[PDB]
Design an enzyme around this catalytic site. Sequence first.
Site, PDB file in Angstrom:
ATOM      1  CG  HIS A 141      -1.996 -16.958 -17.666  1.00  0.00           C
ATOM      2  ND1 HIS A 141      -3.086 -17.806 -17.734  1.00  0.00           N
ATOM      3  CD2 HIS A 141      -0.991 -17.560 -18.347  1.00  0.00           C
ATOM      4  CE1 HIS A 141      -2.730 -18.899 -18.394  1.00  0.00           C
ATOM      5  NE2 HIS A 141      -1.469 -18.775 -18.777  1.00  0.00           N
ATOM      6  NE  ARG A 177      -3.812 -20.772 -21.272  1.00  0.00           N
ATOM      7  CZ  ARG A 177      -4.154 -21.935 -21.843  1.00  0.00           C
ATOM      8  NH1 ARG A 177      -5.283 -22.002 -22.568  1.00  0.00           N
ATOM      9  NH2 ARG A 177      -3.376 -23.045 -21.691  1.00  0.00           N
ATOM     10  NE  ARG A 223      -1.679 -17.118 -21.715  1.00  0.00           N
ATOM     11  CZ  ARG A 223      -1.445 -17.184 -23.027  1.00  0.00           C
ATOM     12  NH1 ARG A 223      -2.267 -16.604 -23.889  1.00  0.00           N
ATOM     13  NH2 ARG A 223      -0.398 -17.852 -23.485  1.00  0.00           N
ATOM     14  N   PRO A 236      -8.837 -21.767 -24.163  1.00  0.00           N
ATOM     15  CG  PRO A 236      -9.700 -23.843 -24.775  1.00  0.00           C
ATOM     16  CD  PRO A 236     -10.073 -22.559 -24.109  1.00  0.00           C
ATOM     17  CG  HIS A 257       3.469 -17.527 -19.836  1.00  0.00           C
ATOM     18  ND1 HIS A 257       2.251 -17.486 -20.471  1.00  0.00           N
ATOM     19  CD2 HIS A 257       4.108 -16.374 -20.162  1.00  0.00           C
ATOM     20  CE1 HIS A 257       2.164 -16.376 -21.183  1.00  0.00           C
ATOM     21  NE2 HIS A 257       3.266 -15.673 -20.992  1.00  0.00           N
ATOM     22  CG  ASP A 258       1.915 -23.268 -18.079  1.00  0.00           C
ATOM     23  OD1 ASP A 258       0.819 -23.858 -18.345  1.00  0.00           O
ATOM     24  OD2 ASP A 258       2.681 -22.747 -18.942  1.00  0.00           O
TER      25      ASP A 258
END
EC number: 3.1.3.-
Length: 399
Positions: free
Chosen positions: A12, A15, A87, A17, A292-293
């Site tokens: 994503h 963003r 996100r 936190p 996602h990471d």
Amino acid sequence: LKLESVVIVSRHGVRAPTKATQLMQDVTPDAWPTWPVKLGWLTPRGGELIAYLGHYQRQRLVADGLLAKKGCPQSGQVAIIADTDERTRKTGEAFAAGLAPDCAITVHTQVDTSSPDPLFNPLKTGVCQLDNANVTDAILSRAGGSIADFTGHRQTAFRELERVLNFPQSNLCLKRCSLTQALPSELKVSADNVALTGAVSLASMLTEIFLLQQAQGMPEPGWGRITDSHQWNTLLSLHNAQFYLLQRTPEVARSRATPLLDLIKTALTPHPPQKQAYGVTLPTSVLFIAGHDTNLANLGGALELNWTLPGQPDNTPPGGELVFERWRRLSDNSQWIQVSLVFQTLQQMRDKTPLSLNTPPGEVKLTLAGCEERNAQGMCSLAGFTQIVNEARIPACSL
Ligand code: NI
Ligand code: NI
Ligand code: NI
Ligand code: NI
């Protein structure tokens, strides 16, 4: 070599936190700057940066002959799957907007938006489970033998983070000295998750927050105490380090990446077009997956893809793309898989720079380290890719 298919696994975009804890307050005397959206949501700027990658990809893909120069791609020719997070959904929307504006490409998600999607982690829905003793040993071994060994080798970075935080004047410190000792970090390994507590996870989170500030265009990330590229690289090594341990370790990564590996393999295999996951017809020309990471890192460690990103201190940055391509070699019509990491440099995020063929994102060509059948360009045969996916995947973790 004629480009026939592409699958983009994207983090994503920028963003806010995900959390705002008391511990975050206690480790600095300064106030964390506030964000323009709810915890964890994509910022409008975040969306704009992803849409630049979409515009870039369209140009690039047009030049490769895969997508037409004018008009909307034909129906089903581009597909987008996204995790249920705001996100990730919005990252999908943004990428469609950059790639094919006003074409209203559908962003698909799982039926239920309020529960987790196991494609993005099968552990979290209990599809399968980690082997506790094995994962513990594997991660400790990757840490240098203990988590104390791990922080011992990274003392310099921890002290860089303390400087930025002004940790000596912080509440934690005034009561009582150092992050790694004030907050002892332990490996917690459960059936569905591995985690590190204390300084190692706080450091990973805080340094990513500084990166996001910078990428968000905030005036003074790190209260103005981060002033050159060496500091950025130093700070973010703590983020990369926790991911090396918790997300790239194969004893975790393989399980956690298994549904994505099946999806990617399916998308890249010549086969009559057929409605499958999310009611998306595969194979097709472009598939964009917004996650996602962790996903990026899980794939990287499952597939033995190694990288660092020049000009981008986070190895798994906002909008970073793991790009799988199937290329047809015309001399003998053989099929080949190429893997790359496409990313905006931190300066490209900071300056919000429009991306294009003359101003491209960074890109790192990768090699599948287990691949036995390689062409001149470092690509892995389709058959070689297929075998690697079959060995890497954990069947019990499949959907
Ligand atoms: Ni998610
Ligand atoms: Ni060591
Ligand atoms: Ni659909
Ligand atoms: Ni990251």
